[PDB]
Every structure is written in structure tokens, then in C-alpha cells.
Ligand binder design. Structure first.
Ligand SMILES: *[C@@H]1O[C@H](CO)[C@@H](O[C@@H]2O[C@H](CO)[C@@H](O)[C@H](O)[C@H]2NC(C)=O)[C@H](O)[C@H]1NC(C)=O
Ligand SMILES: *[C@@H]1O[C@H](CO)[C@@H](O)[C@H](O)[C@H]1NC(C)=O
Ligand SMILES: *[C@@H]1O[C@H](CO)[C@@H](O)[C@H](O)[C@H]1NC(C)=O
Ligand SMILES: *[C@@H]1O[C@H](CO)[C@@H](O)[C@H](O)[C@H]1NC(C)=O
Length: 212
């Protein structure tokens, strides 16, 4: 084609909740481009609702953002960069974004999936039974385990016996919490107990420790 659009390689963009995101869209055109007579429109739709809405409409003479703070800048366009910036991205803004460019009579488009993730914060509730509460994470998938390091065997051992993890619960802001319980008793002195939280938003597991 004479007119093409390239989005993020692979089709998916992941971003931390509340960060300022830039969703890529680069224009390729085989003939000289009049950026003042071109049209760029960004659309959004939830991954479960086929309802699609406009996020930003650019026309050489004028521009309109439908989601506040959203911007495609004329200066980036000079290098064919039609990327959309969304300051302070929210969980509800995850889903699929379509970039559509029109250079009459041609039209080109590209789509990308935006995934917004929130990292869990974890805390121990030690006041027989000990708890570990992880909170404010998104998506719901999470793996909570417990491990222990004793003096006699100085290496982590995962505790599978006597661990009951409660249901994942919903927060009004759209994130989730989950609490895991460790039952003890018959223990050696100086053992370090650890609640280990694994989630997609985490680059490394979150570990919270305590001794008795
Ligand atoms: C999910 O966990 C969070 C963190 O513990 C809970 O938020 C706290 O709620 C208490 C009780 O109202 C407040 O005093 C704190 O200020 C909150 N902590 C912070 C800093 O966010 C939240 O209540 C839990 N959600 C559910 C569904 O119970
Ligand atoms: C997003 O940009 C704003 C500038 O308006 C800045 O204050 C904010 O911290 C940025 N977000 C992050 C966490 O990088
Ligand atoms: C670019 O488009 C604008 C609006 O149609 C027009 O005024 C201008 O002459 C064009 N530039 C060219 C083709 O030199
Ligand atoms: C818990 O122990 C692990 C391994 O010894 C350590 O990497 C981690 O930073 C500790 N966590 C805290 C909150 O001190």
C-alpha cells in the first residue's frame, strides 16, 4: 500500500496504572505528505464491549480530545509519529486502541491492546495463625505462597502444609485484595517465615518476613 500504519510490535502494550502512556502509531506514506490536510483518529473499545468511542481526532486545521489530557502532537507528526499520549492512565482505559490515518482517498489503520496493571502492596498481620494481606493489585490472577528458612537447613523451603488462602476480593477502585493464612505451632528457634507474592506487575516477587 502507498499508505501504512505501524503499531507496537506484537500487538500489546503494558503499562502501570496511573503512568503517562504513549501508544505508538507511525505513519508510512510513499508520496510527499501534506500534514495539514491529513486526518488522524484514535478509537477505544473495552475488550468485552464492542462499543467503540473516539479518543482524539486530529485534522490539520483543528484537534479535539474526547478523553481529557489526551494528545497527538503536530510536532511529532513531522516525523510521521501519530502516537497518542494519555496522562495518568486508569484501569478502565485498558482495552483496544485503533489508530486510523486518512490521506484522501487512502486510509490505513492499526490496532493495539493496552493492558493496565497495578502492583500489590503486601503486609503481615501477626496479631498459631499469621496472615499476609496483598492489596490493590490488577489483574486478579495472583500466586501467594509461604516459605521458611530454618537454622538447620539454611535455604528456603516452601510451606504447603497448613496454608489456607482466602478468596480474592473486590475493591471499589477496580483493583483486588487477597489474604493468605499460615498456621504454625513444634518449631525451631530462629526460623524466618516469609509470605511471597507473585504477580504480573512485579519484576521480582514481593517477600515479607517475620520470626517468632
Ligand atoms: C484492601 O486492602 C486495603 C489495604 O489494607 C484496604 O484499605 C485500607 O482500609 C482501611 C480500613 O478502612 C483504611 O483505614 C486504610 O486507609 C486503607 N489502606 C490504604 C492505605 O489503602 C481495603 O479496605 C481492602 N479492601 C477491601 C475490599 O476490604
Ligand atoms: C505524568 O506527567 C505529569 C506532568 O503533568 C507528572 O506530574 C507525573 O508524575 C507523570 N507521571 C509519572 C508518575 O511519571
Ligand atoms: C496542504 O493542505 C492545505 C489544506 O488543504 C493547503 O492549504 C496547502 O496548500 C497544502 N499544501 C500543499 C499541497 O502544498
Ligand atoms: C525478606 O527476606 C528476603 C530474603 O532474605 C529479602 O530479600 C527481603 O528483602 C526481606 N523483606 C523485607 C521486607 O525485609
Amino acid at each position: 500500500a502507498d499508505l501504512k500504519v505501524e503499531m507496537m510490535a506484537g500487538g500489546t502494550q503494558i503499562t502501570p496504572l496511573n503512568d503517562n502512556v504513549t501508544i505508538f502509531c507511525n505513519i508510512f506514506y510513499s508520496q510527499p505528505l501534506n500534514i495539514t490536510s491529513m486526518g488522524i483518529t484514535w478509537f477505544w473499545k473495552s475488550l468485552t464491549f464492542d462499543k467503540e468511542v473516539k479518543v482524539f481526532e486530529f485534522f490539520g486545521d483543528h484537534q479535539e480530545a474526547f478523553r481529557p489530557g489526551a494528545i497527538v502532537s503536530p510536532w511529532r507528526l513531522k516525523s510521521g509519529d501519530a502516537s497518542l499520549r494519555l496522562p495518568g492512565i486508569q484501569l478502565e482505559e485498558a482495552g483496544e486502541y485503533r489508530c486510523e490515518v486518512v490521506v484522501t482517498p487512502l486510509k490505513a489503520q492499526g490496532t493495539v491492546q493496552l493492558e493496565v496493571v497495578a502492583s500489590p502492596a503486601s503486609r503481615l498481620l501477626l496479631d498459631d495463625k499469621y496472615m499476609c494481606e496483598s492489596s490493590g493489585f490488577y489483574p486478579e490472577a495472583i500466586n501467594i505462597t509461604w516459605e521458611k528458612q530454618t537454622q538447620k537447613f539454611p535455604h528456603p523451603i516452601e510451606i504447603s502444609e497448613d496454608v489456607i488462602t482466602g478468596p480474592t476480593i473486590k475493591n471499589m477502585d477496580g483493583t483486588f485484595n487477597v489474604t493468605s493464612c499460615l498456621k504454625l505451632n513444634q518449631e525451631d528457634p530462629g526460623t524466618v517465615y516469609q509470605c511471597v507474592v507473585r504477580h504480573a506487575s512485579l519484576h521480582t516477587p514481593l517477600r515479607s518476613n517475620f520470626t517468632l
